[PDB]
Design a protein around this ligand. Structure first.
Ligand code: MG
Ligand code: MG
Ligand code: MG
Ligand code: MG
Ligand code: MG
Ligand code: MG
Ligand code: MG
Ligand code: MG
Lengths: 136, 106, 190, 172, 197
RNA sequence: UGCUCCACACAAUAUAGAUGGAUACGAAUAAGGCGUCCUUGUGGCGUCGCUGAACCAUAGCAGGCUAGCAACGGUGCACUUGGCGGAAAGGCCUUGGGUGCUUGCUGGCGAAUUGCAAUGUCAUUUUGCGUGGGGAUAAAUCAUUUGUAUACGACUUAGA
RNA sequence: AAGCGUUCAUAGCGACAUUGCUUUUUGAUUCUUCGAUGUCGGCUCUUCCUAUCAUACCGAAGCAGAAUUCGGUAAGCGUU
């Protein structure tokens, strides 16, 4: 007796939407969509992380679920003030997507000794886990 | 341990060639886990062995080795040009070569 | 052209509930349940307030936004079909030979048998699809009424009966005989 | 015919004894470099005045950068082009951050929609429209709506590996 | 990098998947294709059925038995696509074709082996939404392939057992993830986390 | 004193190309997976993806000898209990006991001279041969014969 | 599409013009064959094409019926 429709939540191309640059000089940094140029191109700005204010193709960036209040066409100082005000940095850093990015970067930073240590620790951890699986 | 490998697996694809003329002096090698020429610069100068086996014992072993080295990168997908002391048998198009870590700079 | 977003509304009366997941639309109301597979269209349905459902095409061209207003009509006809129903009204048109339409039940299949069409000894059979009820209305000469839950099934049965009585090898502008649809409407409209 | 630049090319006739200090004409030229910029300047100056490169000179070449390169503008570009059977004037309306990027977009647009090469294009004028609702084309006016939002359905993800173990999704 | 790579043919465009397979065999990789009846071709069914009838009329006039062979099965249709991207008349080409098995459905022993996809060739990733396509099984039955029903029947029996297997695997991985969940906050877990593991 | 199967001993034979692990839902993609709860739905809530860059595994004379501590797990070998799998099943899930090993933790000894690198040989088919442990004890062709056959072969018949 | 078609350009035709297709006509060319590719027609036999005579299903008519005419899919099957 209740109408049910799945909404299928999507990330929208909007002013204030926080975007991740996946290709270019930034390639892993954050920016905010400031202006919508067309269906394929938007003006982005990432002054906190060092992304220069620029018009960029939507296909070489990926939209994050993060959004914050930002006026259309806002300048670099206004974006920077409202980026820190909305605490975008640690809201992004809390996401499991950002945790996995840091996990991959840390994993490629292991040395041969550190890779050996991970091996010994994983053997130690799994011995108790196999014990806990045996009893449960 | 279960793995004694000290080399990186590679595949012999073909010779250096145009559309209809090949150059058996130069072999094209695809290295596992290499996808760009910038990534393929690590393997320049590294020694490559082709390990095969024969029924006749030659010098105490039934295993024979063909030695070469990576000369340069090839293309955009991490393929490298290698040159061997003797050219490859050409039946090894699609066989497994072994790319060693020496001469080691890193 | 590539319109950014094209929008169509879908009114939902309080008697019916619309359950859309993926593009499987089901409309359960007073008269029954109607299901339509729209998995070939690429539209987005958005429920609003239990009486308004929004359908939209994001970044679509001319042939895509044209099909969007078609999706609006298909769901509306499901809603109309389950609130008011659908009723199609025939007339038996003939000049000399009386067309003798009857409902026959051979091994539980519910066919429409048509006899004596232009003196034919051939017996014309038209299957009645599931969800369609056939009535021969009285207080009127030579009329058969097709009632059901889906306008797709009712009008196809209407076209089936209309097409089985086509005249062959004759001037059809003079031999106007045949069963035609004379009124399209709803079960409840007074 | 690369990423275009705008050039401030000023040229004149060669001064003579009878009439020294000629009128010293100026044009704005969209070209990939200064060599094409001088060539395009002389070409258009052939259409207007009794002059040619042998009987004239170039007194100044100057690149013109966008005054505000990183603000989005609506541009009205008048253009005269040769089709397969005639010459036509048309007006295009482009939304981008620079005159060079708008002109680059129009060269892509005229080649794609009319098969008009750079050879057969005369950029009559590039003039930014200052105010909204003076814009005339629906394909750019639709992006000037209040609080414009839209999704990107069916995201296609590129994989470095030739094989995938997951059967991925197009969510976005 | 597997010794044998098993590709689940469902949702794959035929020429883009077979061009991927052609390069893999000539590079020395063993490739097995399953569910070739679920392959896809861009373009309407009638358009693709018309192209197969243009193929069907091509035959050696003086003897049809020595002419082109019009294989109707989707696995053999897929194999014909592969040949043409492999120099099949040479010894190296015959060695590459010896590294490929194609199948309708998933026969044993590939039923209990992991299947992969080729996103470089997937229909949902390459075709534009709103473009009509064609399923190879429907096309093949339209041109004389005789085993669509038994393949569909035997696939249903396989899918039932496979679904039952996954439930007994969903339960086991649920218990394993719970044991890993309680293993956290220990001395070893915090050292692994600081080392990315 | 022939044949076949099993095991271990020695030879030849070669490798379209081992060098930790082919690691199993199905369906959709304008949608899904996982978990949780209920009034079991085309349900609510939370979370995830943005690639396998994963997961598992992986330390020891190519992996030796040996003393313990913790735990009753992990894992190999054959043996055994039951079940399931016919698409090409030839594999998967298992009960129980024995026998090793365990790097989960702490010790003791050994390694050298392959001399500054030479794949430094460790794999899997096949063919024999020998040894010792089981198993079975025929046909087919020619020749003769028939004519449901036939140019000849072939075909179809018959004969202790 | 000027006209014919009782009236009505286009049911069926269609002037004055103009755009093509085909290679079963005949011209035009002389590239191959002059140390030779057996030069007409018929008989026999197979196959192919469609620009469809018949047959199957149709659409149009100045199609009432009958008979016709125009057009579509179509060379499966026949054409003495
Ligand atoms: Mg080359
Ligand atoms: Mg008639
Ligand atoms: Mg080919
Ligand atoms: Mg047949
Ligand atoms: Mg160990
Ligand atoms: Mg001549
Ligand atoms: Mg002769
Ligand atoms: Mg025709």
């Amino acid at each position: 007796t209740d109408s049910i429709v799945k909404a299928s939540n999507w990330r929208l191309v909007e002013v204030g939407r926080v975007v991740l640059i996946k290709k270019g000089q930034s390639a892993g940094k954050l920016a905010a969509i400031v202006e919508i140029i067309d269906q394929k191109k938007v003006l982005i700005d990432g002054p906190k992380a060092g992304v220069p204010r620029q018009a960029i193709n939507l296909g070489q960036v990926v939209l994050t679920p993060l959004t914050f209040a930002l006026p259309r066409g806002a300048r670099t100082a206004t974006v920077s003030k409202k980026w820190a005000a909305a605490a975008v940095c640690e809201k992004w850093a809390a996401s499991s997507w950002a945790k996995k990015i840091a996990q991959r970067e840390r994993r490629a930073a292991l040395t041969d000794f550190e890779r050996f240590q991970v091996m010994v620790l994983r053997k130690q951890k799994r011995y108790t886990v196999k014990k806990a699986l045996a009893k449960a | 341990a279960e793995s004694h490998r000290l080399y990186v697996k590679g595949k012999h694809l073909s010779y250096q060639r145009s559309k209809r003329v090949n150059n058996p002096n130069v072999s094209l090698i695809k290295i596992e886990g290499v996808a760009t020429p910038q990534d393929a610069q690590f393997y320049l100068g590294k020694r490559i062995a082709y390990v095969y086996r024969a029924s006749k014992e030659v010098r105490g072993s039934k295993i024979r080795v063909m030695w070469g080295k990576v000369t340069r990168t090839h293309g955009n997908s991490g393929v490298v040009r290698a040159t061997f002391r003797n050219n490859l048998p050409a039946k090894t198009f699609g066989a497994s070569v072994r790319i060693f870590l020496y001469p080691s700079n890193i | 052209m590539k319109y950014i977003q094209t929008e169509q509304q879908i009114e939902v009366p309080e008697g019916v509930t619309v359950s859309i997941k993926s593009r499987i639309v089901k409309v359960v109301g007073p008269r029954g349940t109607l299901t339509k597979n729209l998995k070939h269209i690429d539209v987005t349905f958005t429920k609003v307030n239990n009486q308004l459902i929004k359908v939209a095409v994001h970044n679509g061209g001319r042939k895509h936004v044209a099909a969007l207003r078609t999706v609006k009509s298909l769901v509306d006809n499901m809603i109309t079909g389950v609130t008011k129903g659908y009723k199609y009204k025939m007339r038996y048109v003939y000049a000399h030979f009386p067309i003798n339409v009857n409902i026959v039940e051979k091994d539980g299949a519910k066919f429409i048998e048509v006899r004596n069409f232009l003196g034919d000894k051939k017996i014309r059979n038209v299957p009645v699809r599931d969800g369609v009820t056939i009535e021969f209305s009285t207080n009127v000469k030579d009329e058969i009424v097709l009632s059901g839950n889906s306008v797709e099934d009712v009008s196809q049965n209407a076209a089936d009966l209309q097409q089985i009585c086509r005249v062959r090898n004759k001037d059809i502008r003079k031999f106007l005989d045949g069963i035609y649809v004379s009124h399209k409407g709803f079960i409840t409209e007074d | 015919m690369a990423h275009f630049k705008e050039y401030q090319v000023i040229g004149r006739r060669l001064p003579t004894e009878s009439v020294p200090e000629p009128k010293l004409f100026r044009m704005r030229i969209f070209a990939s470099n200064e060599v094409i910029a001088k060539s395009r300047y002389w070409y258009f100056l052939q259409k207007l005045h009794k002059v040619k490169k042998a009987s004239g000179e170039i007194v100044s070449i100057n690149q013109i950068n966008e005054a505000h390169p990183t603000k989005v503008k609506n541009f009205g570009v008048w253009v005269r082009y040769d089709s397969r059977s005639g010459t036509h004037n048309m007006y295009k309306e482009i939304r981008d951050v620079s005159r060079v990027a708008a002109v680059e977009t129009l060269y892509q647009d005229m080649a794609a929609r009319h098969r008009a090469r750079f050879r057969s294009i005369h950029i009559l004028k590039v003039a930014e429209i200052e105010k909204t609702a003076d814009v005339k084309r629906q394909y750019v006016k639709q992006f000037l709506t209040k609080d414009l939002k839209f999704p990107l359905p069916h995201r296609v993800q590129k994989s470095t590996k030739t094989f995938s173990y997951k059967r991925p999704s197009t969510f976005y | 990098v597997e010794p044998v790579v098993v590709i689940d043919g469902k949702g794959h465009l035929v020429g883009r998947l077979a061009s991927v397979v052609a390069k893999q065999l000539l590079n020395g990789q063993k490739i097995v294709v399953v569910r070739a009846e679920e392959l896809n071709i861009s373009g309407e069914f009638f358009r693709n059925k018309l192209k197969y009838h243009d193929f069907l009329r091509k035959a050696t006039a003086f003897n049809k038995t020595r002419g082109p062979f019009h294989f109707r099965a989707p696995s053999r249709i897929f194999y014909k696509a592969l040949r043409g991207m492999v120099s099949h008349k040479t010894a190296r080409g015959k060695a590459a074709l010896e590294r490929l098995k194609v199948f309708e459905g998933i026969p044993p022993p590939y039923d209990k082996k992991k299947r992969v996809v080729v996103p470089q060739a997937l229909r949902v990733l390459r075709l534009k939404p709103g473009r009509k396509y064609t399923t190879l099984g429907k096309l093949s039955t339209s041109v004389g392939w005789k085993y669509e029903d038994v393949v569909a029947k035997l696939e249903a029996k396989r899918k039932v057992s496979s679904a039952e297997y996954y439930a007994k695997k969903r339960a086991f991985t649920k218990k394993v993830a719970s044991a890993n969940a309680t293993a956290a906050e220990s001395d070893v877990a915090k050292q692994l986390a600081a080392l990315g593991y």
